[PDB]
Design an enzyme around this catalytic site. Structure first.
Site, PDB file in Angstrom:
ATOM      1  N   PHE A   1     -13.771 -27.682  60.600  1.00  0.00           N
ATOM      2  CA  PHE A   1     -12.844 -27.725  59.478  1.00  0.00           C
ATOM      3  C   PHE A   1     -11.845 -28.860  59.670  1.00  0.00           C
ATOM      4  N   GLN A   2     -11.843 -29.807  58.730  1.00  0.00           N
ATOM      5  CA  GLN A   2     -10.938 -30.957  58.753  1.00  0.00           C
ATOM      6  C   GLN A   2     -11.119 -31.782  60.026  1.00  0.00           C
TER       7      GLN A   2
ATOM      8  N   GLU B   1       0.479 -39.664  53.703  1.00  0.00           N
ATOM      9  CA  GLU B   1       0.378 -40.235  55.042  1.00  0.00           C
ATOM     10  C   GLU B   1       0.322 -41.756  55.008  1.00  0.00           C
TER      11      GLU B   1
ATOM     12  N   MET C   1      -1.493 -61.241  40.080  1.00  0.00           N
ATOM     13  CA  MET C   1      -2.222 -62.168  40.940  1.00  0.00           C
ATOM     14  C   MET C   1      -3.682 -62.280  40.518  1.00  0.00           C
TER      15      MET C   1
ATOM     16  N   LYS D   1      -6.043 -29.723  69.210  1.00  0.00           N
ATOM     17  CA  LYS D   1      -5.086 -28.633  69.038  1.00  0.00           C
ATOM     18  C   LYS D   1      -4.961 -27.789  70.301  1.00  0.00           C
TER      19      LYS D   1
HETATM   20  C1  LIG Z   1      -1.231 -62.698  48.118  1.00  0.00           C
HETATM   21  C2  LIG Z   1      -0.992 -63.391  49.465  1.00  0.00           C
HETATM   22  C3  LIG Z   1      -0.815 -64.771  49.512  1.00  0.00           C
HETATM   23  C4  LIG Z   1      -0.594 -65.402  50.752  1.00  0.00           C
HETATM   24  N1  LIG Z   1      -0.421 -66.740  50.770  1.00  0.00           N
HETATM   25  C5  LIG Z   1       0.089 -67.279  51.898  1.00  0.00           C
HETATM   26  C6  LIG Z   1       0.600 -68.594  51.930  1.00  0.00           C
HETATM   27  O1  LIG Z   1       0.587 -69.388  50.770  1.00  0.00           O
HETATM   28  N2  LIG Z   1       1.093 -69.079  53.060  1.00  0.00           N
HETATM   29  C7  LIG Z   1       1.110 -68.336  54.164  1.00  0.00           C
HETATM   30  O2  LIG Z   1       1.638 -68.877  55.339  1.00  0.00           O
HETATM   31  N3  LIG Z   1       0.641 -67.096  54.180  1.00  0.00           N
HETATM   32  C8  LIG Z   1       0.128 -66.548  53.066  1.00  0.00           C
HETATM   33  N4  LIG Z   1      -0.341 -65.283  53.100  1.00  0.00           N
HETATM   34  C9  LIG Z   1      -0.161 -64.466  54.333  1.00  0.00           C
HETATM   35  C10 LIG Z   1      -1.406 -64.584  55.264  1.00  0.00           C
HETATM   36  O3  LIG Z   1      -2.699 -64.271  54.741  1.00  0.00           O
HETATM   37  C11 LIG Z   1      -1.200 -64.585  56.800  1.00  0.00           C
HETATM   38  O4  LIG Z   1      -0.454 -63.477  57.164  1.00  0.00           O
HETATM   39  C12 LIG Z   1      -0.468 -65.864  57.223  1.00  0.00           C
HETATM   40  O5  LIG Z   1      -1.009 -66.949  56.560  1.00  0.00           O
HETATM   41  C13 LIG Z   1      -0.644 -66.073  58.750  1.00  0.00           C
HETATM   42  O6  LIG Z   1       0.570 -65.692  59.408  1.00  0.00           O
HETATM   43  P1  LIG Z   1       0.870 -66.353  60.929  1.00  0.00           P
HETATM   44  O7  LIG Z   1       0.273 -67.740  60.994  1.00  0.00           O
HETATM   45  O8  LIG Z   1       2.362 -66.425  61.157  1.00  0.00           O
HETATM   46  O9  LIG Z   1       0.166 -65.389  62.117  1.00  0.00           O
HETATM   47  P2  LIG Z   1       0.620 -63.796  62.432  1.00  0.00           P
HETATM   48  O10 LIG Z   1      -0.227 -62.853  61.605  1.00  0.00           O
HETATM   49  O11 LIG Z   1       2.078 -63.609  62.085  1.00  0.00           O
HETATM   50  O12 LIG Z   1       0.395 -63.473  64.068  1.00  0.00           O
HETATM   51  C14 LIG Z   1       1.326 -64.034  65.005  1.00  0.00           C
HETATM   52  C15 LIG Z   1       0.662 -65.003  65.768  1.00  0.00           C
HETATM   53  O13 LIG Z   1       1.565 -65.493  66.882  1.00  0.00           O
HETATM   54  C16 LIG Z   1       1.182 -65.016  68.045  1.00  0.00           C
HETATM   55  N5  LIG Z   1       2.286 -64.382  68.696  1.00  0.00           N
HETATM   56  C17 LIG Z   1       2.737 -63.167  68.446  1.00  0.00           C
HETATM   57  N6  LIG Z   1       3.773 -62.920  69.241  1.00  0.00           N
HETATM   58  C18 LIG Z   1       3.995 -63.994  70.015  1.00  0.00           C
HETATM   59  C19 LIG Z   1       4.920 -64.336  71.025  1.00  0.00           C
HETATM   60  N7  LIG Z   1       5.948 -63.391  71.438  1.00  0.00           N
HETATM   61  N8  LIG Z   1       4.837 -65.531  71.592  1.00  0.00           N
HETATM   62  C20 LIG Z   1       3.910 -66.408  71.234  1.00  0.00           C
HETATM   63  N9  LIG Z   1       3.025 -66.120  70.288  1.00  0.00           N
HETATM   64  C21 LIG Z   1       3.042 -64.932  69.666  1.00  0.00           C
HETATM   65  C22 LIG Z   1      -0.043 -63.923  67.803  1.00  0.00           C
HETATM   66  O14 LIG Z   1      -1.052 -64.040  68.875  1.00  0.00           O
HETATM   67  C23 LIG Z   1      -0.624 -64.365  66.470  1.00  0.00           C
HETATM   68  O15 LIG Z   1      -1.675 -65.419  66.675  1.00  0.00           O
HETATM   69  C24 LIG Z   1      -0.555 -64.661  51.914  1.00  0.00           C
HETATM   70  C25 LIG Z   1      -0.734 -63.265  51.870  1.00  0.00           C
HETATM   71  C26 LIG Z   1      -0.953 -62.638  50.639  1.00  0.00           C
HETATM   72  C27 LIG Z   1      -1.149 -61.123  50.580  1.00  0.00           C
HETATM   73  C1  LIG Z   2      -4.456 -51.778  47.816  1.00  0.00           C
HETATM   74  C2  LIG Z   2      -4.880 -53.079  47.170  1.00  0.00           C
HETATM   75  N1  LIG Z   2      -5.763 -53.059  46.205  1.00  0.00           N
HETATM   76  C3  LIG Z   2      -6.192 -54.254  45.570  1.00  0.00           C
HETATM   77  C4  LIG Z   2      -5.680 -55.435  45.963  1.00  0.00           C
HETATM   78  C5  LIG Z   2      -6.129 -56.720  45.296  1.00  0.00           C
HETATM   79  N2  LIG Z   2      -5.046 -57.351  44.625  1.00  0.00           N
HETATM   80  C6  LIG Z   2      -4.377 -58.514  45.093  1.00  0.00           C
HETATM   81  C7  LIG Z   2      -4.896 -59.466  46.149  1.00  0.00           C
HETATM   82  C8  LIG Z   2      -3.981 -60.665  46.254  1.00  0.00           C
HETATM   83  O1  LIG Z   2      -4.936 -58.810  47.389  1.00  0.00           O
HETATM   84  O2  LIG Z   2      -6.186 -59.898  45.797  1.00  0.00           O
HETATM   85  O3  LIG Z   2      -7.114 -60.134  46.907  1.00  0.00           O
HETATM   86  S1  LIG Z   2      -2.856 -58.708  44.217  1.00  0.00           S
HETATM   87  C9  LIG Z   2      -3.320 -57.451  43.065  1.00  0.00           C
HETATM   88  C10 LIG Z   2      -2.526 -57.070  41.838  1.00  0.00           C
HETATM   89  C11 LIG Z   2      -1.046 -57.046  42.136  1.00  0.00           C
HETATM   90  O4  LIG Z   2      -0.441 -56.136  41.253  1.00  0.00           O
HETATM   91  P1  LIG Z   2       1.127 -56.169  41.084  1.00  0.00           P
HETATM   92  O5  LIG Z   2       1.779 -55.101  41.875  1.00  0.00           O
HETATM   93  O6  LIG Z   2       1.519 -55.777  39.712  1.00  0.00           O
HETATM   94  O7  LIG Z   2       1.672 -57.598  41.490  1.00  0.00           O
HETATM   95  P2  LIG Z   2       1.978 -58.793  40.499  1.00  0.00           P
HETATM   96  O8  LIG Z   2       3.374 -59.266  40.641  1.00  0.00           O
HETATM   97  O9  LIG Z   2       1.961 -58.375  39.080  1.00  0.00           O
HETATM   98  O10 LIG Z   2       0.949 -59.965  40.756  1.00  0.00           O
HETATM   99  C12 LIG Z   2      -4.493 -56.868  43.402  1.00  0.00           C
HETATM  100  C13 LIG Z   2      -5.159 -55.815  42.543  1.00  0.00           C
HETATM  101  C14 LIG Z   2      -4.662 -55.435  47.080  1.00  0.00           C
HETATM  102  N3  LIG Z   2      -4.087 -56.645  47.543  1.00  0.00           N
HETATM  103  N4  LIG Z   2      -4.313 -54.301  47.622  1.00  0.00           N
HETATM  104  C1  LIG Z   3      -1.927 -24.462  58.240  1.00  0.00           C
HETATM  105  O1  LIG Z   3      -2.987 -24.318  57.340  1.00  0.00           O
HETATM  106  C2  LIG Z   3      -4.179 -23.893  57.934  1.00  0.00           C
HETATM  107  C3  LIG Z   3      -5.222 -23.504  57.160  1.00  0.00           C
HETATM  108  C4  LIG Z   3      -6.377 -23.094  57.742  1.00  0.00           C
HETATM  109  O2  LIG Z   3      -7.462 -22.688  56.957  1.00  0.00           O
HETATM  110  C5  LIG Z   3      -7.106 -22.094  55.741  1.00  0.00           C
HETATM  111  N1  LIG Z   3      -6.477 -23.077  59.058  1.00  0.00           N
HETATM  112  C6  LIG Z   3      -5.438 -23.468  59.826  1.00  0.00           C
HETATM  113  N2  LIG Z   3      -5.545 -23.453  61.273  1.00  0.00           N
HETATM  114  C7  LIG Z   3      -6.757 -23.924  61.917  1.00  0.00           C
HETATM  115  O3  LIG Z   3      -7.663 -24.327  61.269  1.00  0.00           O
HETATM  116  N3  LIG Z   3      -6.854 -23.918  63.363  1.00  0.00           N
HETATM  117  S1  LIG Z   3      -8.282 -24.479  64.112  1.00  0.00           S
HETATM  118  O4  LIG Z   3      -9.349 -23.515  63.832  1.00  0.00           O
HETATM  119  O5  LIG Z   3      -7.982 -24.731  65.523  1.00  0.00           O
HETATM  120  N4  LIG Z   3      -8.715 -25.964  63.380  1.00  0.00           N
HETATM  121  C8  LIG Z   3     -10.124 -26.293  63.256  1.00  0.00           C
HETATM  122  S2  LIG Z   3      -7.558 -27.199  63.123  1.00  0.00           S
HETATM  123  C9  LIG Z   3      -7.337 -28.076  64.693  1.00  0.00           C
HETATM  124  O6  LIG Z   3      -6.262 -26.612  62.784  1.00  0.00           O
HETATM  125  O7  LIG Z   3      -8.123 -28.138  62.152  1.00  0.00           O
HETATM  126  N5  LIG Z   3      -4.289 -23.876  59.250  1.00  0.00           N
END
Ligand SMILES: Cc1cc2nc3c(=O)[nH]c(=O)nc-3n(C[C@H](O)[C@H](O)[C@H](O)COP(=O)(O)OP(=O)(O)OC[C@H]3O[C@@H](n4cnc5c(N)ncnc54)[C@H](O)[C@@H]3O)c2cc1C
Ligand SMILES: Cc1ncc(C[n+]2c([C@@](C)(O)OO)sc(CCOP(=O)(O)OP(=O)(O)O)c2C)c(N)n1
Ligand SMILES: COc1cc(OC)nc(NC(=O)NS(=O)(=O)N(C)S(C)(=O)=O)n1
Ligand SMILES: Cc1cc2nc3c(=O)[nH]c(=O)nc-3n(C[C@H](O)[C@H](O)[C@H](O)COP(=O)(O)OP(=O)(O)OC[C@H]3O[C@@H](n4cnc5c(N)ncnc54)[C@H](O)[C@@H]3O)c2cc1C
Ligand SMILES: Cc1ncc(C[n+]2c([C@@](C)(O)OO)sc(CCOP(=O)(O)OP(=O)(O)O)c2C)c(N)n1
Ligand SMILES: COc1cc(OC)nc(NC(=O)NS(=O)(=O)N(C)S(C)(=O)=O)n1
Ligand SMILES: [Mg+2]
Ligand SMILES: [Mg+2]
Ligand SMILES: [Mg+2]
Ligand SMILES: [Mg+2]
Ligand SMILES: [Mg+2]
Lengths: 582, 582
Positions: free
Chosen positions: A121-122, A59, A485, A171
């Site tokens: 359940f679930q 998922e 990283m 459900k």
């Molecule tokens: C390992 C790592 C390293 C990173 N390092 C960097 C880095 O060096 N530099 C960097 O820039 N980022 C970096 N980031 C990404 C980061 O943390 C943020 O996502 C980024 O910095 C912020 O993006 P943004 O400013 O575009 O805002 P966004 O997250 O893109 O949000 C959009 C903004 O614009 C506004 N907006 C949205 N739609 C509209 C519209 N239709 N009209 C007007 N306004 C709108 C929203 O209100 C929101 O404030 C890194 C991420 C990771 C995972």
């Molecule tokens: C679900 C999840 N778990 C752990 C994370 C914490 N982080 C990172 C960070 C930036 O979020 O550190 O804050 S990066 C990173 C390691 C990246 O392994 P790679 O895929 O091999 O990439 P590369 O080219 O080798 O560097 C970890 C463990 C994460 N972000 N997501």
């Molecule tokens: C498909 O596999 C299974 C397995 C299983 O048990 C073995 N039971 C069910 N069906 C239900 O459980 N119905 S229910 O009682 O209405 N629920 C609580 S629910 C909404 O689905 O979480 N499906």
């Protein structure tokens, strides 16, 4: 005129109302994983001849696929899961879509209403869990509320600042027979009254007045400009202001253009951070002033009049107080300013060639650099070859780490929505499922997953989804046998003390582990490994020319560091420009 | 067949739907205070010819009046207030109705839906505030939900364990025209599935079996038996088990009866606490095992098989684990046991005369005692005179303090719902407004407010409500110039160090302050003051014989203490039997 599969007076199951509610929203692709609580929805999906379901193997891969579907097309991404464990696996995707403002609609099954709260359940209170990591959520308590809630869910997810909206459906509601009313009015009175309005001319003329009075203007473009590529490009022609994009705003203004400063921030180019540091007018369009860009807020743009345009009033003045503010769509704000800049063109006489030459000098003295060691493949060079062989027209999805930064630096994105990456949450395992959703939304496009060996393995099960759905997803795996990283921060600030960052086998230390080629072979995906730099160009060309999926295991020396780097809480004077782990 | 004032196809205001929804619930009296947010409701109340509004002078007096209306009749009490300050004044009444399980429906106005959350004029999130002090609350978001929510509000407030239900109605919903649908089904699936069922015969026969095997049985009757006076009395005839009532269960079994142990607990009689301490079978019917009765749970009924019957499954086993439990209506549980006790009468041969004589000895050696000092009026004696002159048929409402305990000890209540007092929350200022609601629900009854000088003054403004509505409310004010209950705990556990417990004027120390007679004179209520014990009988007789309202300022020496007293966390061996503040 919508054509239903049921008569207007014919009772139908609530699940059939839910699917038809998606059909009336233009939904063509969902990412649903079946379960006991959502079996009625899956049965109703088979009766639909217009909605295609892409069954993932996890998922989390389903919600990440819905993100890539949304990030690469502007349409909302729809993922469906069952109650309990199926719903809890969407948590990382919901929080990721909220921080990156991705339009998403998640539908989760739920125990019957009579069993809610009985530790059934679930059963998990998914509404209580996801309230703080979603834009809004619902718990459908009656079958007649399905047409309204689905309409409100898609409206909230796509309007204003986009975000994920979860709809929990018990459900017994899915099984209940009813006649849907598709004419119900949405119950969002306070939200619609607070929706931004078209920008006033008084605010736009004040911005244009500050442009003529400024000598060192810099454009601060972010994820809010993904739908304003034409309006932003027209704005640059009329002003000649250099553009600095965030990690989310890449592609809004072409990186290959001469007026592009590429990315700014912690790992942004030296000349982009130099422009903002020594600017007098900062045009912050569609940004949120993240600490990854500003660092120390006291020193970020300390000499610039800040103009902030944002569609969310809560973002204007949060981390830094601007001089002029415009709350609304930056697309309309650019359209209004372009008209003023064209009629009053000769009246303003805009020319910033002196400021641009000051930046062109900084661009030539401090460009993006990478060192080549013998025949070892530089990860920066491999991505640069992918840019050339794809002409920069490929949709790129990445994981999180060093490979994510190199894919942002060394690839020139011509249009927005080519760059799909987790920036706000930074969730690993995002690259591969997002490429699935992008390939479905763009079948005739080149989709390449620039993934890391750590991020790729987290959702490696989605390789089966790629083969079954026959998606031309390319996997450019930059394998460095490490969590690169985290390894880089160990070398810089922890005396290179390795703390569980090596991903290989310590027994066979010099063996590539795991053998990612056999992962692709298990799912019937052709794969190959390249180690020498000379064989790199032919290997990437084979990946692109081979029809269908393909995995290219690119071996890279792990001692590489992402440069430049501004330490956390630092300023422009603290930028690290050279160094690695050798 | 209900007769509406509007045509079935005629649109009407939402406020007119709200009032008609009350009419269809049998509502005849509401306690509404007007305000900007609830003006539409008040205008719709004037159009109703069957719903009478008793305008209070304070919303806290309005909700307390709704409690007395409910406590003295079994019907739900309805109070209406405006948004903001009007709604926040109901908080003490809502929390009081929840702890005492009083059926109550509170309707509060609210800002229009578009203005909610904007810090609007007179806006408070009353749903967020009262969620933890109400059984359930609502925020009506559409005019068509009014008929369903009002039906669900009255159902939840009166069924199962009663409690207060708040319904927040925005102003735009009150003004919106609509055609109500009175055939909507309530959306309470999980609540109705968890409703208690009639008790099984296997559980009832096991209780009757424990009665025959026991030698020292004691009945533990509480507020859950207010509708089982006949069933409980029939149960006592067939078993001969002595009855010990809580502060809430007074009147369920007549206090004047020979089999009555009167009240038990902290201020309960010595022989009632003795019976529970040395019992082998404790029949806990309609109680919740409060610490005011048990004290130290380890020593409470340490030698008794506990049989707990309660309609709330959360109360069974909370503070003490029983041997036999029955989750359901104690009214039906008594009816089922009475049939078994009558057919198997000669088979069981029930006789507890040896155990009753053991308690009759304790009753004669440690009875309720009060000391008379010269001509000073004993507060216990004054209430005992009120019992004689009213033949114990008067509805008694009290405040909180020493006067509340003496009104419970020295008055013999023949039937339940004669005793209206705040026990769970213990809110002062409850006596006077509750007498207003009781007098309205019982016009031909003798309503007497046994209030204290501190509790009476808190809601003294309701004297104007008594005069305007012409209610025959008698006020037996036991004036001791002190916060007597807090003063008593100062003498016992704080070396008589007075800490803001004197309510008079320190300048004129020996002057009765305030002059409560002038409070009644301000509202045109005849009043009189009695100080000598000889003039007490004629003064109370004048209060009863004088038609309409009347206030009797009874001066009492403040050094009196409520006896007996079991300290907090103590056991039966720690009971205080003598002593005062002299
Ligand atoms: C390992 C790592 C390293 C990173 N390092 C960097 C880095 O060096 N530099 C960097 O820039 N980022 C970096 N980031 C990404 C980061 O943390 C943020 O996502 C980024 O910095 C912020 O993006 P943004 O400013 O575009 O805002 P966004 O997250 O893109 O949000 C959009 C903004 O614009 C506004 N907006 C949205 N739609 C509209 C519209 N239709 N009209 C007007 N306004 C709108 C929203 O209100 C929101 O404030 C890194 C991420 C990771 C995972
Ligand atoms: C679900 C999840 N778990 C752990 C994370 C914490 N982080 C990172 C960070 C930036 O979020 O550190 O804050 S990066 C990173 C390691 C990246 O392994 P790679 O895929 O091999 O990439 P590369 O080219 O080798 O560097 C970890 C463990 C994460 N972000 N997501
Ligand atoms: C498909 O596999 C299974 C397995 C299983 O048990 C073995 N039971 C069910 N069906 C239900 O459980 N119905 S229910 O009682 O209405 N629920 C609580 S629910 C909404 O689905 O979480 N499906
Ligand atoms: C100053 C002061 C002193 C006090 N001192 C004492 C004292 O000495 N002694 C004393 O007893 N109290 C005293 N109290 C009152 C007190 O704090 C509690 O209200 C009381 O002790 C508990 O009442 P209860 O056991 O009858 O439960 P209640 O509050 O009356 O609740 C009723 C119980 O019965 C159940 N029930 C309700 N309806 C039904 C039904 N139809 N069928 C079956 N079950 C049902 C409910 O689930 C609940 O558990 C004092 C209060 C004050 C303010
Ligand atoms: C709204 C409110 N505020 C304060 C209270 C704390 N208490 C009391 C108590 C038992 O709750 O102590 O816990 S009793 C009490 C004083 C009683 O003044 P009186 O009316 O004169 O009665 P008497 O015949 O003289 O004894 C106070 C201040 C209260 N319950 N309600
Ligand atoms: C009766 O006395 C007053 C006084 C007053 O101000 C001086 N305003 C109003 N009316 C409104 O305020 N209407 S409103 O704008 O829809 N509200 C925010 S509300 C729901 O009523 O709180 N009544
Ligand atoms: Mg602001
Ligand atoms: Mg790696
Ligand atoms: Mg239990
Ligand atoms: Mg007052
Ligand atoms: Mg007093």
């Amino acid at each position: 005129t919508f054509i239903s599969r049921f008569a207007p007076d014919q009772p139908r199951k609530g699940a059939d109302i839910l699917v038809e509610a998606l059909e009336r929203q233009g939904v063509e692709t969902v990412f649903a994983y079946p379960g006991g609580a959502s079996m009625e929805i899956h049965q109703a999906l088979t009766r639909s001849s217009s909605i295609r379901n892409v069954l993932p193997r996890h998922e989390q891969g389903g919600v990440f696929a819905a993100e890539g579907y949304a990030r690469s097309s502007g349409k909302p991404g729809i993922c469906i899961a069952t109650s309990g464990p199926g719903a809890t696996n969407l948590v990382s995707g919901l929080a990721d879509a909220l921080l990156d403002s991705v339009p998403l609609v998640a539908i989760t099954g739920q125990v019957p209403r009579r069993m809610i709260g009985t530790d059934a359940f679930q059963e998990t209170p998914i509404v209580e869990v996801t309230r703080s990591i979603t834009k809004h959520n619902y718990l459908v308590m009656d079958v007649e509320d399905i047409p309204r809630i689905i309409e409100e869910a898609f409206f909230l997810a796509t309007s204003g600042r986009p975000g994920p909206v979860l709809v929990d459906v018990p459900k017994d509601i899915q099984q209940q027979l009813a006649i849907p009313n598709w004419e119900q009015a949405m119950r969002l009175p306070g939200y619609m009254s607070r929706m931004p309005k078209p920008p006033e001319d008084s605010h736009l003329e004040q911005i244009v007045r500050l442009i003529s009075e400024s000598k060192k203007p810099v454009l601060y473009v972010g994820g809010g400009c993904l739908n304003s590529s034409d309006e932003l490009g027209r704005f640059v022609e009329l002003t000649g202001i250099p553009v600095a994009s965030t990690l989310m705003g890449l592609g809004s203004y072409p990186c290959d253009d001469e007026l592009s400063l590429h990315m700014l921030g912690m790992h942004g180019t030296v000349y982009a951070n130099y422009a903002v540091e020594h600017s007098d007018l900062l045009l912050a369009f569609g940004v949120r002033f993240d600490d990854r860009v500003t660092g120390k807020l006291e020193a970020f743009a300390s000499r610039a009049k800040i103009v902030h345009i944002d569609i969310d009033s809560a973002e204007i003045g949060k981390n830094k107080t601007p001089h002029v503010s415009v709350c609304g769509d930056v697309k309309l704000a650019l359209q209004g300013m372009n008209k003023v800049l064209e009629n009053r063109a000769e009246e303003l006489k805009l020319d910033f060639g002196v400021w641009r030459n000051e930046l062109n000098v900084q661009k030539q003295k401090f460009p993006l650099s990478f060192k080549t060691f013998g025949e070892a493949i530089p990860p920066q060079y491999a991505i640069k070859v992918l840019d050339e062989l794809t002409d920069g027209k490929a949709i790129i999805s990445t994981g999180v780490g060093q490979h994510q930064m190199w894919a942002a630096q060394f690839y020139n994105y011509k249009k927005p929505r080519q760059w799909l990456s987790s920036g706000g949450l930074g969730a690993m395992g995002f690259g591969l499922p997002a490429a699935i959703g992008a390939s479905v939304a763009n079948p005739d496009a080149i989709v390449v997953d620039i993934d890391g060996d750590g991020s790729f393995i987290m959702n490696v099960q989605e390789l089966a989804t790629i083969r079954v759905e026959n998606l031309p997803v390319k996997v450019l795996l930059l394998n460095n046998q490490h969590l690169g990283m985290v390894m880089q921060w160990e070398d810089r600030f922890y005396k290179a003390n390795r703390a569980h960052t090596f991903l290989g086998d310590p027994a066979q230390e010099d063996e590539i582990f795991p053998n990612m080629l056999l992962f692709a072979a298990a799912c019937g995906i052709p794969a190959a490994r390249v180690t020498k730099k000379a064989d790199l160009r032919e290997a990437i060309q084979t990946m692109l020319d081979t029809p269908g999926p393909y995995l290219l295991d690119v071996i890279c020396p792990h001692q590489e560091h992402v440069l430049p780097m501004i330490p956390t809480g630092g300023t422009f004077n603290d930028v690290i420009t050279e160094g690695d782990g050798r």
